[PDB]
């Protein structure tokens, strides 16, 4: 195929706010076979960081020499496996008898497990304020810094609401200044209710991640367990963000109790192998003045959505 894959990273590697770009860098880096090279040859990775080049606002886009946009990691991989030439090491091509289970696994990391990593990027107060909301200053341009992680945190709250979590001011304003002792303890009845609510949220998270990784690993043992499929690269790119965040050591422990330490360290041996692989397969590109998302180009891209 001939196209240009757009990603979220910053000039040499995909950013950790998007597990679909991290997994797609490794997908292109691991096409070393003769058949797997044919579906990836001439893909021209661009780190544009603007979602106006997307058909649906999500940014692994494959804009492929006609205007045909394929978006998101799972749609691109299923597109590239469909466009092989048709005629084992570092990336497998599943056969006809295994195409459905390999798409079922790819879809399950996209809908169930990547719902949990976008919790950990945006709905975690330790991770969002330390790491994530100060990561878009490195990726985007000068007015568009404070709306992109704010819209992405509103999206992850709607996406994880059904699994995880004017006299009201004048009511105490006649009494709390007039009592002066629980004006200090007006916040104390809030952080006293904030404390048992964030551990209330961390239990309905950590049994969802305990079940989404148990369901995926039990269905993964139906295909070949010794070879790397394209659904493994989206699973490992979800650990690699969830463990590599500021709050990753709480989760590296919580997965080690259920699944062991011989598996969380076997997954992190593959994970750190894939980050430290050479970019000789990666032919990169710089964005032009239609793919940058400047101050002048994101107003022209603001008027065309209503024209």
């Amino acid at each position: 195929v001939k196209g240009s894959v757009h990603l979220w990273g910053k000039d040499g590697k995909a950013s950790l706010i998007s597990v679909d770009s991290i997994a797609l860098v490794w997908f292109i880096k691991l096409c070393t076979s003769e058949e797997a090279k044919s579906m990836v040859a001439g893909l021209q990775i661009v780190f544009s960081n603007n979602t106006d080049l997307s058909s649906d606002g999500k940014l692994p886009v494959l804009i492929l020499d006609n205007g045909t946009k394929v978006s998101g990691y799972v749609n691109i991989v299923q597109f590239l496996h469909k466009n092989i030439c048709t005629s084992e090491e570092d990336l497998a091509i599943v056969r006809k008898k295994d195409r459905l289970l390999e798409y079922s696994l790819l879809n399950y990391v996209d809908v169930e497990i990547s719902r949990l990593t976008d919790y950990q990027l945006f709905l975690n107060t330790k991770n969002y304020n330390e790491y994530t909301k100060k990561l878009f200053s490195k990726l985007l341009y000068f007015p568009m810094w404070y709306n992109t992680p704010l819209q992405l945190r509103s999206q992850a709250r709607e996406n994880c609401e059904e699994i995880i979590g004017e006299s009201k001011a004048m009511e105490s304003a006649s009494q709390l200044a007039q009592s002066k002792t629980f004006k200090i303890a007006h916040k104390n009845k809030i952080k006293g209710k904030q404390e048992l609510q964030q551990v209330k949220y961390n239990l309905q998270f950590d049994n969802r991640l305990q079940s989404c990784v148990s369901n995926w690993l039990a269905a993964r043992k139906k295909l070949d367990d010794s070879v790397i499929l394209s659904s493994d690269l989206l699973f490992l790119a979800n650990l690699y963000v969830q463990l590599g965040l500021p709050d990753g050591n709480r989760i590296r422990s919580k997965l080690e109790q259920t699944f062991g330490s011989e598996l969380l360290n076997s997954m992190s041996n593959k994970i750190d192998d894939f980050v430290h692989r050479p970019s000789n397969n990666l032919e990169q590109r710089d964005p032009q003045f239609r793919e940058q998302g400047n101050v002048v180009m994101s107003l022209y891209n603001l008027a065309c959505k209503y024209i």
């Binding site: 909301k133 100060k134 200053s137 490195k138 404070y146 004017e166 006299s167 009201k168 004048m170 009511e171 304003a173 006649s174 009494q175 200044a177 007039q178 009592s179 002066k180 002792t181 200090i184």
Partner: protein
């Protein structure tokens, strides 16, 4: 609020001197430092329906169209002039907010030349609390002895404000006794409205106290300018020492060619590590009030909770 602005136009029409009370004693230290920043885009229109009934309305991006129906009757025949910043007089206020039917009320009855009375009910249907307080108070030329009986639990109280002796070395107190909570409270204030020859200015040295916690505060509040004003509060604590240093730089303006007036504000805090800005610009009837809050703890400077607030009234 608007209950605390109706209260101040009755006082200046009856000549009661609310600035010598223990709720406007640390006045400049809070109007330049702990102002409210709007957290979203906001629109508001106010009006006046009956001779003794006002109406309000506001809607933001967050909440829908809200409202309020005020009532206000008073024998003070110079009342409404001071709404815009012997006879036994009176006042009756009452306001229901109607997305939610939250009530409030206020009754003032100046029972003497030098004695008042103040009921202040707030009765919300939801988040239910019928707070019903009574503020008996006997002003003199050197006191504002003021007994409060609240009804949050059964909270009683006291205040006093003895003026001494430009050099106005004031003094205050309060002694609150919860009759159900059994949790006392106290304070002390030593503010000092002075004069200086640097720019022409008062000071406000509020050497506050709270002997139960040892919660000593401070305040400096200059007036470095004919229009501008500067403040600097230094919080402290005893036996569990933990400090702070806030700031504030309210800067006035006047424009002509109705007259445009713009009042700028800043609030540099250090324990909270923030920087609050606000601009409040008026007209004949319109009023725009924008405000941001930068947080300094690479890219540290993240402007959380920007907001603008339009308001028209008559």
């Amino acid at each position: 609020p608007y209950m605390d602005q109706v209260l101040r136009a009755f006082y200046q029409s009856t000549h009661w001197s609310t600035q010598n009370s223990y709720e406007d004693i640390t006045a400049t230290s809070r109007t330049l430092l702990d102002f409210r920043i709007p957290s979203a885009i906001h629109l508001q229109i106010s009006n006046k329906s009956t001779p003794n009934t006002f109406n309000s309305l506001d809607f933001s991006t967050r909440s829908r169209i809200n409202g309020s129906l005020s009532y206000l009757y008073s024998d003070a025949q110079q009342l409404e002039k001071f709404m815009r910043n012997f006879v036994k007089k009176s006042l009756y206020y009452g306001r229901m907010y109607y997305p939610s039917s939250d009530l409030e009320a206020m009754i003032i009855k100046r029972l003497s030349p030098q004695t008042q009375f103040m009921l202040k009910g707030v009765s919300s249907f939801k988040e239910s609390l019928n707070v019903l307080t009574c503020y008996f108070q006997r002003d003199s030329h050197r006191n504002l002895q003021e007994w409060i009986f609240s009804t949050s639990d059964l909270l009683c109280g006291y205040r006093v404000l003895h003026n001494f002796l430009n050099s106005s070395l004031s003094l205050g107190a309060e002694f609150w006794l919860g009759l159900v909570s059994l949790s006392p409270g106290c304070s002390t204030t030593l503010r000092y409205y002075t004069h200086s020859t640097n720019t022409g200015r008062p000071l406000t040295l509020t050497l506050s106290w709270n002997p139960l916690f040892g919660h000593i505060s401070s305040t400096y509040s200059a007036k470095t300018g004919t229009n501008s004003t500067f403040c600097a509060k230094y919080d402290f604590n005893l036996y569990s020492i933990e400090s702070n240093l806030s700031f504030g730089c309210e800067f006035w303006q006047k424009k002509h060619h109705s007259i445009f007036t713009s009042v700028w504000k800043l609030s540099t805090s250090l324990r909270d590590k923030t920087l609050k800005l606000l601009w409040e610009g008026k007209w004949r009837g319109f009023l725009i009030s924008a405000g941001t809050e930068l947080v300094f703890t690479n890219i540290p400077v993240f402007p959380a909770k920007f907001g603008i607030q339009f308001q028209y009234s008559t």
